[PDB]
Amino acid sequence: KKYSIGLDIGTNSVGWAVITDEYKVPSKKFKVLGNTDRHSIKKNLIGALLFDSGETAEATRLKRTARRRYTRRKNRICYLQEIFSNEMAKVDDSFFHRLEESFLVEEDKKHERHPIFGNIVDEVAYHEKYPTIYHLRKKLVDSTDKADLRLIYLALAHMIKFRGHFLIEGDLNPDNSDVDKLFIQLVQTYNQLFEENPINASGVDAKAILSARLSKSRRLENLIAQLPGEKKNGLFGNLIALSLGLTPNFKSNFDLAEDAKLQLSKDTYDDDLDNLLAQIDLFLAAKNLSDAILLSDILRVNTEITKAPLSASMIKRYDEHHQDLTLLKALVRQQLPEKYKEIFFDQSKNGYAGYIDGGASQEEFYKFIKPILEKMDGTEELLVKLNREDLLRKQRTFDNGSIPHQIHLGELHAILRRQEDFYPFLKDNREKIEKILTFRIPYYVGPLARGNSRFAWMTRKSEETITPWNFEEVVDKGASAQSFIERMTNFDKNLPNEKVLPKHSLLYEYFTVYNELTKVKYVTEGMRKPAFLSGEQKKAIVDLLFKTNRKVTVKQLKEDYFKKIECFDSVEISGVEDRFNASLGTYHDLLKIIKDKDFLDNEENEDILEDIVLTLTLFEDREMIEERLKTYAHLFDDKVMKQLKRRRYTGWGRLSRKLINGIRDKQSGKTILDFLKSDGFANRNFMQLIHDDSLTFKEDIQKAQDSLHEHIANLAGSPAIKKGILQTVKVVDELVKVMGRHKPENIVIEMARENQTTQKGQKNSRERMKRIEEGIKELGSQILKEHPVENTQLQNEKLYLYYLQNGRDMYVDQELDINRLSDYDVDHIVPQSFLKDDSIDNKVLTRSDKNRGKSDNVPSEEVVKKMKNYWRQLLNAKLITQRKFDNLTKAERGGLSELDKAGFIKRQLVETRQITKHVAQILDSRMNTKYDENDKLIREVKVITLKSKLVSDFRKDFQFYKVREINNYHHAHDAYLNAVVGTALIKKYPKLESEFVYGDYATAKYFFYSNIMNFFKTEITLANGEIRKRPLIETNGETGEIVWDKGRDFATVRKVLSMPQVNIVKKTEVQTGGFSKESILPKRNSDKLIARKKDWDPKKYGGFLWPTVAYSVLVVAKVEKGKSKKLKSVKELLGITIMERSSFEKNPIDFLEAKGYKEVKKDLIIKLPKYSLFELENGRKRMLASAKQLQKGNELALPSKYVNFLYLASHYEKLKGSPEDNEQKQLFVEQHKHYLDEIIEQISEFSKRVILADANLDKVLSAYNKHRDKPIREQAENIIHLFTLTNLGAPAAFKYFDTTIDRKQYRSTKEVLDATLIHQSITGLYETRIDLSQLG
RNA sequence: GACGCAUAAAGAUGAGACGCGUUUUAGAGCUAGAAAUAGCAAGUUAAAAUAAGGCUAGUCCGUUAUCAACUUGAAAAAGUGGCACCGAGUCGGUGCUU
DNA sequence: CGTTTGTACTGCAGCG
DNA sequence: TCTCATCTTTATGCGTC
DNA sequence: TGCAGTACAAACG
Ligand SMILES: [Mg+2]
Ligand SMILES: [Mg+2]
Ligand SMILES: [Mg+2]
Ligand SMILES: [Mg+2]
């Protein structure tokens, strides 16, 4: 009467099995509804539920932000048009209309078809006179004539529409740069400031450096070889400070004005300049020189005097494009005329025609044309350009990602300065246009909604419509930025109405040091036993060395405290190993700035210091930090305030101020921190205080502490875990409804947790800085001597990757620079568009252009040749992983492939952990509802939580082998075995219920769970060869009850695993998502195209082509078809696509009449979602997949001897057993060689029954007969692929040894219009069978 | 089985920007030609759209999640389905019973 | 006698 | 691809219910 | 892994 439930929970499936107390799986007869005559079904209470994996919300977030950027960009253009409109009315009234409607064909355009000037001669002359928009922009920048207002608008609109990135702060000005001679201006400035006859007769300037990659070695050798300066400050120490940073934290060289720290032009370099402005302009040339150098790095324009450097570079690309194109055409004509059409006309290939008019990328074009240019004669210049990636460049390419907004801003400023004289309105609102360009909504303000968007936390000072000119006056940035952090920080889990403290807060750090320190035990020779510290001793320790050293080690504690204070010869310290996990880092940081230590020691200012830390943790805007901390002006020096506004803190703790220092025990009056600081002789820590009954903290916590779906909606985190948790709770609820509403005693849950030895644990969690140091010391670079770093800083992903690449780029043989890590990027080897993989094995830090050129592809094979040696050097220095090396050299082993795609992604295991961990507690709280006053919760239902290692070892040890590819019964079987072994362990070890039952309470731990399964074993083999004989019948021990009988229980289990009928049910999901695959196909004369706007006929404009069908609907109606049209009765599936689901559901009958159906019977409309199950002759089951394709739905019940033989025949040499066990398994394989032909007969019979792919069956049998003399291991590991032929799910394609049989998609939803429809309940037990033959 | 701290692996949710790509149109093709065509020369850029759209009209919102049937309820959500045994090719058979 | 339903076989999917 | 911010799962170590 | 396309051949009117 009593029973249990086992669950094997995964990401895309949940398994379930019900067992009685003798491990037998019960079975029952069930009623089946519907109009069919069949009235009862026998089903075994074991099965699996399968569903598509829950998708995460990143795929939605990316599209949503993209839609926001497009919405804001169109509004930028509308703002510019609104500024220009009153003047455009004078010169060309319909010009904005012609631009706006320019996508329409000529017959639909209301105005003249030529957009800009509106007549043929003006338009063609304009395109002759300015071939590209950059010609126009350079002309406007460097011309003083009144230009056409339409041309002005086009230049400004182009600049605003494509405005470059904002990653560079400040006023990086091309206008005060772009001429590299300013080294001479710097040296006469050095002549003015430095008086001991400084060098003015200089040699080679920084041009020789800007020719190649910027480097300290190159720079220093150039400066020494061309400038033997009297001071290394003058020749090196100043010029780097105008052009680079200084590596050490030590002071700079011998000072001229002040010897403090010097650095590159950082965000605080202006306050750094007090080393000269408070002492004495050389450092005024710093901005100019650095901007000129870095802009010369960005752009290949130095000699020209033009004020538009980006446009100069683009026009240079254009003219070199033209010259090299003419030369290439003439050359290919004069040597290879036969290749002329292939290169310059055939746009299907990667020739020049495909590179311009077709879709071939620049890298594909280069790899196509390089063999021709190498074969041909006279193309050395072109080949050199190709190796420099300059041959036939486009103006707008992927490389333009590195152009900053300041260059566009400088060009626009020059344009408006030029044209302010002729048009007054460009001088009146020049600031308005400039703000239209340069404005950007801050990341902490979010979408500017007005209470109708669930993502918006913005709050506003007035109800005005927000424009970029009044954003600062309208949006309350203070409250908005505060809410930007407060809306995501976790509440205190004990006190749910409190926000947690910053992790670097002073109260938190005092809590942590005292909590970790009040439990340390010391012992001396004199006294008897270890005891805790006294309160005064704790006070002395913190005030002596925890307030005066950033970290405290055991040796520091023992010599520095005990050997000098309360002097003892030697003391042993227990409770800490070598160094303390706690620290006072915030206090030390504020001691290095706030020189007044007694101010930090004071108590009345604790609220002030907490407010300071709260501000530094919340706000990171510089002005905002000043606005908030400005109330502390009278407390501190101005320079102190200057240093305080530089210290950024981040990260929030797990506790609240009220919990750690606010609530007081009414008997005593102390808080938690006070009890930690002094509690006499007991010295309880935080938990031991909050759980001590004698204190009011426990009751104050307890007193301070709808549907299941609504609780799930309350649960934060991933939206993917919700599907798994909700499905498994629904399955368990269905089982408890089936079994007479009696709750099971035991529920077994397969946790994916694991135990490891402590050596493997500390190896796999070793310090990241030590990981870097080992490889750096191995390959012998001086990078860590040059650039010190601490393991806390290495949490920066890019700094991590910089050190793992030994400072050098990986795809290109160029050194990186720490100071400009923003200019680089973190590249996935295997791209995001292919496979979700963010492991550090899959991240490489390269230059921006190389990553963006290497789009959605593994590294190119030329790159592989260039850097296979360096990657081998890193692997020998074990900075990279062997998996990282295999990814990096992927191009040699075939490149991208389905072998790479197929597998278990690292995300699914985290998904399994999260789902299963939530399911444990949700099942405990759902089942166990009988609270009590004697004890809080009566454990009516035990939720046993087994680790997967136990059940897997059970399978490996009793030959109940698991093979994934054969069928989907294995989920139900794993659930069944989990239930068996969990109940068996609880019955056999009632003294060991407490570590398995959820809700009761390291090398030893791993050994402890190795021996727990010994009682199942008949014999125990040790390393010494001894054996131990166990009794055939096991007993409970202290109670004497029989639990596990190795005679009959194994027979029962082996009987269950050979069961043929198991309830396999696939979830009937109504599809939702994007309306169609996003590729915009060109125009054709067909109606399968989807119009991408309501006004654009796809036969003229092209559109999307692959629609998703949300759910199919069965219709019975009349259609008007024939040579002479007549009404014909017809019954077929109609696809409802997602773009059109809402329009259907609003009015079904009218919609179907609009489709052309007549006499639709409204009652017979059956919504058939995806995966609906039909049943046909001989039990053939077909799963509906859309409205046209059907999926396979039967499952192969392969016998256990065959399954076990297949697994044992595979893995033939890696059996991991003793030689004798391997030999006996091998001999067993030898003496069942006939099982191969047996299994082939099984596949043949099953496929002829239900798969009905006779051609592929014949091909597979032919392959088997022509491969039947192959080795047995190869034969088994290739016959395991044939089960893809009968596997449940979508039709698929599979290869036997060489013969590749392909996909046989069943594309004919006519046979399922007469079948029997199976509406299956959530578990697969309760069915409803509608006979579709009798409808019509 | 929980929690604090430290180290670490792999992940998650939200925001602010860039670079492209695609589609249609603008960029007069010329020459011999009845021409079916072929020769020649051009080629790089721009506009607009970038889920159809929605209404509270916001410089907002629109791909995550929820979803057997049936009796119901606007829906949230709740209710509905005999048992023993003998057997096993996707479940059957026997016997009881409402 | 003329469609047009039927397999078969291939080919495709925006991105850094 | 870049920038900024938060939370989760787990293994080990120390201390606890 | 559904949908798209290109081809061809039955199979009814
Ligand atoms: Mg599994
Ligand atoms: Mg979904
Ligand atoms: Mg990439
Ligand atoms: Mg733990």
Numbering used by the authors: 3 to 282, 288 to 712, 718 to 1013, 1032 to 1366
The article reads:
CRISPR-Cas9 is a powerful tool for genome editing, but the strict requirement for an NGG protospacer-adjacent motif (PAM) sequence immediately next to the DNA target limits the number of editable genes. Recently developed Cas9 variants have been engineered with relaxed PAM requirements, including SpG-Cas9 (SpG) and the nearly PAM-less SpRY-Cas9 (SpRY). Here, we combine structural and biochemical approaches to determine how SpRY interrogates DNA and recognizes target sites. Here, we show that SpRY binds diverse PAM sequences by forming non-specific interactions with the phosphodiester backbone of the target DNA.
Having established the molecular framework of DNA targeting by SpRY, we then aimed to elucidate the mechanisms governing the behavior of its precursor, SpG-Cas9, which has an NGN PAM preference. To probe whether SpG and SpRY operate through analogous mechanisms of engaging diverse PAM sequences, we determined the structures of SpG bound to NGG and NGC PAM-containing DNA substrates with global resolutions of 3.1 Å and 3.6 Å, respectively. Through structural analysis of SpG, we uncovered that four mutations (D1135L, S1136W, E1219Q, and T1337Q) engender DNA duplex interactions mirroring those delineated for SpRY. Intriguingly, the mutations G1218K and R1335Q, which adopt different rotamers for different PAM sequences in SpRY, maintain the same rotamer conformation in the context of SpG. This observation raises the possibility that R1333 in SpG is pre-ordered and poised for rapid PAM recognition similar to Cas9. Therefore, SpG recognizes DNA targets through a hybrid mechanism of base-specific and non-specific electrostatic contacts that resemble both Cas9 and SpRY. Our structural analysis of SpG revealed that it engages diverse NGN PAM sequences through a hybrid mechanism combining base-specific and electrostatic contacts.
